[PDB]
Amino acid sequence: ASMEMEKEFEQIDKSGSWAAIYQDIRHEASDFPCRVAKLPKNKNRNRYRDVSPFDHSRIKLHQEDNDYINASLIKMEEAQRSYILTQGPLPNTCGHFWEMVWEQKSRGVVMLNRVMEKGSLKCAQYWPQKEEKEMIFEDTNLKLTLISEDIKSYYTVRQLELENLTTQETREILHFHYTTWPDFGVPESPASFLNFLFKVRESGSLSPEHGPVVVHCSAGIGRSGTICLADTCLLLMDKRKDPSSVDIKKVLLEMRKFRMGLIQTADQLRFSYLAVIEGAKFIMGDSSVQDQWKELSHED
Numbered sequence: 001a002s003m004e005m006e007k008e009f010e011q012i013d014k015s016g017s018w019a020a021i022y023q024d025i026r027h028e029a030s031d032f033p034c035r036v037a038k039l040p041k042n043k044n045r046n047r048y049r050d051v052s053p054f055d056h057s058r059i060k061l062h063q064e065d066n067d068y069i070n071a072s073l074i075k076m077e078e079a080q081r082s083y084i085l086t087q088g089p090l091p092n093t094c095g096h097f098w099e100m101v102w103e104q105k106s107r108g109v110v111m112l113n114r115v116m117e118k119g120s121l122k123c124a125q126y127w128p129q130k131e132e133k134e135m136i137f138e139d140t141n142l143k144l145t146l147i148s149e150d151i152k153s154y155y156t157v158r159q160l161e162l163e164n165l166t167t168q169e170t171r172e173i174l175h176f177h178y179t180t181w182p183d184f185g186v187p188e189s190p191a192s193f194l195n196f197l198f199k200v201r202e203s204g205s206l207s208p209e210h211g212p213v214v215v216h217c218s219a220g221i222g223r224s225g226t227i228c229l230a231d232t233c234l235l236l237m238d239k240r241k242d243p244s245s246v247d248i249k250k251v252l253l254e255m256r257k258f259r260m261g262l263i264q265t266a267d268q269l270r271f272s273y274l275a276v277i278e279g280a281k282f283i284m285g286d287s288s289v290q291d292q293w294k295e296l297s298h299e300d
């Protein structure tokens with residue numbers, strides 16, 4: 001037996017047409033204004049000139065001075081799950097980043113990049129690496145402490161304590177850090193990707209009782225778009241219990257109403273199909289594949 005996304009996958013593969021399929025998505029994608037992102041006062045808040053949040057879906061900081069951060073709310077109405085996608089913070093926007101986490105009530109942060117990739121600094125060191133060296137973001141009045149970390153062969157999970165120094169309220173934030181996913185590239189296998197995504201799911205960080213999970217890579221679109229497409233597609237299949245109801249290209253186009261550029265290469269699209277097709281086994285009632293993925297991912 002075969003799902004309809006697998007029959008599509010095979011026809012695209014057979015005809016060698018991933019590039020054309022992906023370029024049609026780029027051509028049909030939404031174009032909305034980003035006038036706030038382009039104001040001169042925000043030039044040093046954007047990592048890449050060509051990656052900006054749309055005005056209509058940008059996250060606003062609760063700050064009277066300047067409410068801008070390069071971040072978008074991806075609000076998936078049919079799936080009933082939301083995500084905040086943002087760029088890797090810059091040295092002058094790490095306070096803004098944790099202000100956003102606080103104000104939006106997020107429980108988890110998912111980081112898909114390393115700080116240094118391809119010889120360049122793709123992300124600021126925005127969390128503490130040592131328990132005894134906490135960080136204070138003076139501009140936004142927040143304190144951030146590393147509580148513990150669990151290092152696996154290709155990803156790390158950290159427990160952070162984020163404190164609002166004005167109120168002295170504290171919250172536990174979980175940090176899921178994928179350390180082997182190359183920029184402009186794909187994960188090593190569906191299994192290791194799904195093992196990581198299910199670790200995020202299992203944590204409870206995507207619960208609708210929390211604010212949206214924050215997801216980022218360097219730009220907040222290529223790797224970030226890939227994990228969110230796979231997750232949303234799996235959740236739609238789950239609500240429905242119906243793999244055939246899921247149109248992956250249509251879901252990606254819907255996500256691109258909320259942030260530009262989600263999924264940056266044809267191979268990341270192709271990989272998204274592979275991940276959804278494999279994850280469908282778990283959704284449709286074979287929970288043992290989850291142990292298979294963990295074994296295939298060699299976490300230890």
Ligand SMILES: O=C(O)C(=O)Nc1sc2c(c1C(=O)O)CCNC2
Pocket residue numbers: 048050051113122183184217218219220221222223224264
């Ligand atoms: O980090 C990602 O997965 C991602 O989308 N990165 C992106 S998207 C993007 C760039 C990058 C980059 O990292 O250099 C460079 C400028 N053009 C768009």
Ligand SMILES: [Cl-]
Pocket residue numbers: 039040041042
């Ligand atoms: Cl301005």
Ligand SMILES: [Cl-]
Pocket residue numbers: 113114115116
């Ligand atoms: Cl890193």
Ligand SMILES: [Cl-]
Pocket residue numbers: 116117118119120
């Ligand atoms: Cl490097």
Ligand SMILES: [Cl-]
Pocket residue numbers: 089090091121122123124
């Ligand atoms: Cl940086």
Ligand SMILES: [Cl-]
Pocket residue numbers: 026260261262263264
């Ligand atoms: Cl694009």
